[PDB]
């Protein structure tokens, strides 16, 4: 347990957007308290996360410390300005944060952080419709922002506009053809959206996600259930009926295999057996 | 008339603490004033997706009827602090689970009252009558042993057991993670 090890863990925990605020804030505090001088400026980005985790963790005591250090180090910095805005938002102080973000925008118009933080404020305030409108307007100048694109898709799903969510997921997949998560999510959205005209898309995209990752057993039984629903649907043609029945049977075989592997891996009660008892039904 | 066990309340707090930033949901199973003997969590964050909910409900029904229980309640903790009303997802899920047994009523973890020790009952129980869902009396007793629920929730949270808690979503990630989460059950037994 050396500071390099926790440093690497924090770097990884930053590389992938995790939200275990407790663990990351503890590790960052240990690094900046014990091994602050053991490494150079690489803790400075940590000083960001440490406060954000704090704002997520509610422990605001060290948020002021990190903010003051960053501000005293980086005067007149847009990054530190957005960070102060988040600090303000930590206590639902929205007017001052909005004013700060507006000042950042008038100081720099191409900045996207201010727009994201202000729409985050709007969605924290519960104005979901205006948040969707703000994201649509912001994208109109910044088409291609995957994070905002996915956020708008999630907001539409929460608000239940599966058509717009499906469209956003389609363009997101356009951005990332190789991400099986987008394919699985779009298949789910299309299945939730409607019937056979979307059940076919859901099963096709579930198969694509499985192709992109064989371990995505979530999407596996999602394809299984989509095929089963298509089979149960009277509107399925005879050839479509047998095709989706074959898909469901193959998916069920894969599910039994997957649960058998889940069985051989662990040593406990045969819940996997009960699971395939469900599938056989 | 909705009654849930203390282990149900501690599971409520455990799942709320596990994903404090993300709205969560799940079901409560009981044997055939219904007493929710056990609970089970499922998913978090995005909750409006149907396929996961359907596959879940199917697995819940299979697991419960295999072990003599039947699903008889639905729980949901919202993401927003100032949100305590059911959404469309919660309403439809509660209606569908209540379609089997009329005694099934929805419960929502009011995150506004979510604290370390859970001083006040966070869960609010909503009944379906007149084709509408409305809350019961907040002043009603919800847990079977309120001081026991308070102490066990405080001990479990202070013991960092929320990180160890596993819901259906982790099972979806990997079946090796036990979705039946008997670990929290044995912790409850030891604490009690």
């Amino acid at each position: 347990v050396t500071w390099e090890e926790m440093r690497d863990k924090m770097r990884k925990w930053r590389e992938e957007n995790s939200r275990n605020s407790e663990q990351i804030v503890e590790v960052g505090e240990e690094l900046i308290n014990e091994y602050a001088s053991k490494l150079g400026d690489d803790i400075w980005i940590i000083y960001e996360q440490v406060m954000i985790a704090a704002l997520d963790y509610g422990r605001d005591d060290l948020a002021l410390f990190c903010l003051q250090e960053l501000r005293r180090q980086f005067p007149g910095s847009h990054r530190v300005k957005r960070l102060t805005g988040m600090r303000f938002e930590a206590m639902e102080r929205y007017d001052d944060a909005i004013q700060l973000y507006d000042r950042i925008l008038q100081e720099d118009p191409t900045n996207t952080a201010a727009r994201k933080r202000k729409i985050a404020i709007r969605k924290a305030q519960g104005k979901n419709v205006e948040a969707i409108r703000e994201l649509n307007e912001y994208l109109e100048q910044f088409v291609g922002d995957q994070e905002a694109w996915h956020e708008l898709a999630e907001l539409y799903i929460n608000e239940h506009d599966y058509a717009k969510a499906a469209f956003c997921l389609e363009e997101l997949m356009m951005t990332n053809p190789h991400n099986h998560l987008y394919c699985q999510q779009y298949a789910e959205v299309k299945y939730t959206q409607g019937g056979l005209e979307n059940l076919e898309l859901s099963r096709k995209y579930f198969a694509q996600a499985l192709k992109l990752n064989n371990r995505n057993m979530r999407a596996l039984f999602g394809l299984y259930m989509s095929a089963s629903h298509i089979a149960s649907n009277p509107k399925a043609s005879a050839k479509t009926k047998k095709d989706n029945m074959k898909y469901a049977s193959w998916a069920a075989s894969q599910i039994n295999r997957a649960y058998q592997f889940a069985g051989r891996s662990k040593k406990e009660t045969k819940y996997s057996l009960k699971a395939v008892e469900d599938m056989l039904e | 008339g909705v009654k849930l066990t203390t282990q149900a309340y501690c599971k409520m707090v455990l799942h709320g603490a596990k994903y404090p930033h993300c709205a969560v949901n799940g079901l409560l199973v009981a044997e055939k004033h219904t007493l929710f003997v056990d609970c089970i969590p499922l998913f978090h964050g995005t909750l409006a997706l149907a396929p996961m909910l359907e596959v879940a409900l199917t697995l819940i029904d299979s697991w419960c009827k295999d072990h003599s229980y039947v699903i008889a309640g639905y729980y949901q903790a919202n993401e927003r602090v100032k949100d305590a009303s059911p959404n469309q997802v919660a309403e439809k899920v509660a209606s569908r689970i209540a379609e089997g047994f009329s005694d099934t009523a929805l419960i929502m973890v009011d995150n506004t009252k979510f604290t370390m020790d859970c001083v006040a009952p966070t869960i609010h129980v909503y009944e379906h009558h007149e084709n509408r869902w409305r809350c019961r009396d907040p002043h009603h007793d919800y847990c079977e042993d309120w001081p026991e629920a308070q102490r066990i929730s405080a001990s479990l949270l202070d013991s960092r057991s929320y990180e160890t808690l596993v819901d259906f979503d982790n099972h979806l990630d990997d079946i090796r993670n036990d979705w039946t989460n008997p670990e929290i059950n044995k912790a409850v037994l030891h604490l009690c």
Binding site: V129, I132, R133, L135, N136, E137, L139, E140, V143, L152, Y156, E159, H160, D161, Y162, A163, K164, F167, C168, E171, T192, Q193, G194, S228, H229, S232 | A48, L49, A50, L53, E54, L57, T58, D61, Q88, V89, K92, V93, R96
Partner: peptide
């Protein structure tokens, strides 16, 4: 299917790039 729950219903400017009408242009 005993759990065929429907989650559609109310759909609530439009997201940029979106066009609701199904056009057969090809």
């Amino acid at each position: 299917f005993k759990w065929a729950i429907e989650l559609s219903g109310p759909g609530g400017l439009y997201p940029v790039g979106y066009l609701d009408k199904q056009v057969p242009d090809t």
